[PDB]
């Protein structure tokens, strides 16, 4: 922001605010997966108990 004009500084920050916005959804997606077998082992654990 302190090196380029507001007319075309939005081109580059767009490429950066979309990279992180997708670098973060990937963490969520891998977290939904990881909570599916723990939910499938807290059901076997709640069965041997």
């Amino acid at each position: 922001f302190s090196r380029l004009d507001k007319v075309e500084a939005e081109v580059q920050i767009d490429r950066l605010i979309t990279g992180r916005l997708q670098s973060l959804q990937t963490y969520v997606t891998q977290q939904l997966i990881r909570a599916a077998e723990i939910r499938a082992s807290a059901n076997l654990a709640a069965t041997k108990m």
């Binding site: 302190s2 090196r3 380029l4 004009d5």
Partner: protein, 97 residues
């Protein structure tokens, strides 16, 4: 705020979530090294003898205060295009060399 974030007028009993908590600043401090001089821009730009293209001369510029206003105001310019910086944002950054 809780009513205003659930899109309702009657919220149920329980712990909810709301916006964050960011401590705003108080004042502002700007610090620049020490130097109080004038850069030798009036020498290279206004020299009466420029080099040939194949034997160009490269000049150092160090330890001076650089003001590009007295430069960009030159009306008879035919081109002023900058790649990594913008021409109007050159009055707040300190360059290594």
């Amino acid at each position: 705020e809780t009513k205003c974030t659930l899109k309702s007028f009657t919220v149920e009993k329980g712990i909810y979530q709301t916006s964050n908590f960011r401590v705003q600043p108080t004042e502002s401090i700007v610090r620049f090294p020490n130097i109080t001089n004038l850069c030798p821009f009036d020498e290279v730009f206004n020299a009466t003898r420029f080099a040939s293209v194949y034997a160009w001369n490269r000049k150092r510029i160090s330890n001076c205060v650089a003001d590009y206003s007295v430069l960009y105001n030159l009306a008879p310019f035919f081109t002023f295009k900058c790649y990594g910086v913008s021409p109007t944002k050159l009055n707040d950054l300190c360059f290594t060399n």
